[PDB]
Design a protein around this ligand. Structure first.
Ligand code: ADP
Ligand code: AMP
Lengths: 91, 324, 116
């Protein structure tokens, strides 16, 4: 069931307040991003290890010092994996 | 079938058959990285991104349409520089580049003749032959593998295939490379006259004009005696302009070759008596982009290029530089 | 340098608010918490959104992109806002998983989170 409007209670506002639940803690598998792996320039620097089929399609991000956005996701193409890394402006 | 040049004859036959029976998909590693730029990135940024990620090329993404927007290679820069040198009476006009977004660089090229209207690309599930024919129909030395997600109509850039990685693939997968035992000087392959050559004294922009005019990816540097010393590659141009110093173009080749990081695929040489069997082996274990053919005393005789080799196996027996 | 999602600091529901507003500015649509009689359930930090895909909107095709967000406490005071793709579906028929336009949308979202 979708919706277009900001839930009201998140403007009460807002300390006071319910003393609402925490989100769950970070599970161990999002601790590591395969992009940080370049075992491979020996000699094909594009090779990554096999991903982990839980983490297909999760956005990852990275600091550039260049004033653009670094984004990436991993996906199955037929039986092979493509991690695409996008460099993109903000405007 | 049972002697050199009849054994080679047959061996080539298997190799093309091998090529046709595989797909571009098949060449790809089972899990790899692909770096993609927004077409609206500024030129300086994109240069900084190639160097930092250690790459010489990247496919462009037109993100509003979700469409492949061209392939960015050192050729784009080599062609714009040539143009400015041949046309502008103003040496500092080249500096203007830095203001361009990749999209506006591509328009200048479009307007200047330097680009196809039709983007070369192929479906990754089509035949590997498809990839070669295209890369040899246009003299492009790499090609995008593009598919389409029918749920959105958006395009899916799967990879970019280089000539080098097709040949490596062939070197590792075809036993029949070892049966190509015919010396180069018997076959008809490579260029053996009218070499574009340069010396240390030569100016970089003259080397760049040679590169654009002959649609060649590299230029050999020789001494007065014509011994081979080194090479000046279109990828070398990236290292001179990486900091916005477009005056590094007035450097002599020698000066510019000192700014080179170690890193450098090296320069590969063979004798004229060398055969294709050994070369596929050099390829199997090392990153060769071309072979300079030399004599006892390292004197240049000619050039055996990757296109050259691909073209020799795939076929049955002044302006502008293509994607590099 | 590479890590999943985008980092966040501060107060958990303060961040939940910002993400909600950020969606609203992109024009995404979203699920919303529903309490247990009382009483807000921890899954409120699980947001399913739906995004009209602009280049399909340009044809005038009704094709949508499904994106799930999830908050996780990392240290005390530090959070990962995790973003994952549930795929695209047009209102019609008749089997690739591209990262696009999923990546172009995460790009939009991130612009909204930051221009806030
Ligand atoms: N756009 C890109 N994204 C990711 N990796 C790339 C890209 N372009 C080149 N590479 C990688 O850089 C390395 C050097 O390749 P390159 O110089 O482009 O051509 P070649 O395939 O002849 O080595 C290879 O491991 C290749 O996979
Ligand atoms: N310096 C050069 N002078 C003359 N021809 C060359 C030179 N370099 C390469 N060629 C040839 O031109 C074609 C393009 O080479 P390449 O672009 O390096 O694949 C190939 O047929 C080469 O043999």
């Amino acid at each position: 069931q979708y919706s277009t409007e900001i839930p009201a209670f998140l403007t009460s506002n807002t300390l006071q307040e319910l003393k609402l639940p925490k989100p769950p803690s970070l599970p161990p598998h999002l601790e590591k991003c395969i992009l940080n792996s370049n075992t491979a320039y020996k000699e094909d620097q594009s090779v990554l290890p096999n991903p982990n089929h839980v983490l297909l399609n999760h956005l990852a991000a990275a600091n550039t010092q260049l004033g653009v956005l670094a984004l990436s996701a991993t996906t199955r193409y037929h039986r092979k994996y493509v991690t695409t890394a996008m460099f993109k402006n903000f405007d | 079938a049972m002697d050199v040049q009849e054994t080679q004859k047959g061996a080539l036959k298997e190799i093309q058959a091998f090529i046709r029976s595989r797909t571009s998909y098949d060449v790809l590693p089972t899990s790899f990285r692909l770096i993609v730029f927004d077409v609206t990135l500024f030129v300086k940024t994109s240069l900084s991104l190639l160097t930092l990620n250690n790459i010489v090329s990247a496919p462009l993404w037109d993100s509003e349409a979700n469409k492949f927007a061209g392939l960015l290679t050192m050729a784009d820069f080599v062609n714009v520089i040539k143009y400015y040198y041949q046309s502008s009476s103003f040496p500092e006009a080249i500096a203007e580049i830095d203001k361009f977004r990749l999209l506006g660089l591509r328009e200048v090229e479009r307007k200047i003749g330097a680009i196809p209207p039709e983007t070369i690309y192929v479906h990754p599930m089509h035949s590997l032959m498809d990839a070669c024919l295209a890369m040899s129909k246009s003299r492009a030395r790499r090609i995008p593998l593009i598919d389409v997600d029918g749920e959105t109509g958006s395009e899916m850039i799967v990879s970019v295939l280089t000539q080098y990685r097709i040949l490596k693939f062939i070197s590792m997968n075809c036993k029949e490379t070892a049966m190509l035992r015919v010396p180069l000087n018997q076959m008809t392959i490579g260029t053996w006259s009218n070499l574009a050559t340069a010396s240390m004294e030569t100016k970089v922009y003259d080397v760049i004009k040679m590169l654009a005019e002959k649609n060649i990816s590299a230029v050999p540097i020789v001494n007065s005696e014509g011994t081979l010393l080194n090479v000046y590659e279109s990828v070398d141009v990236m290292h001179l302009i990486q900091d916005g110093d477009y005056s590094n173009l007035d450097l002599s080749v020698g000066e510019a070759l000192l700014k080179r990081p170690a890193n450098f695929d090296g320069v590969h040489t063979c004798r004229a008596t060398d055969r294709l069997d050994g070369i596929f082996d050099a390829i199997k274990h090392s990153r060769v982009h071309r072979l300079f053919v030399v004599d006892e005393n390292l004197k240049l005789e000619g050039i055996l290029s990757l296109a050259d080799i691909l073209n020799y196996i795939i076929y049955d027996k002044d302006n502008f530089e293509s994607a590099v | 340098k590479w890590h999943f999602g985008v980092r966040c600091r501060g107060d958990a529901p303060e961040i939940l608010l910002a993400v909600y507003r950020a969606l609203q500015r992109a024009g995404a649509q979203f699920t919303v918490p529903k309490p247990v009689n009382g009483k807000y359930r921890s899954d409120m930090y699980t947001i399913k959104s739906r995004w009209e895909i602009p280049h399909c909107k340009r044809e005038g095709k009704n094709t949508y992109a499904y994106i799930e967000l999830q908050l996780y406490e990392v240290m005390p005071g530090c959070f990962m806002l995790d973003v994952k793709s549930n795929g695209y579906k047009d209102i019609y028929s008749h089997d690739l998983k591209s990262s696009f336009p999923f990546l172009d949308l995460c790009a939009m979202l991130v612009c909204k989170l930051f221009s806030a």
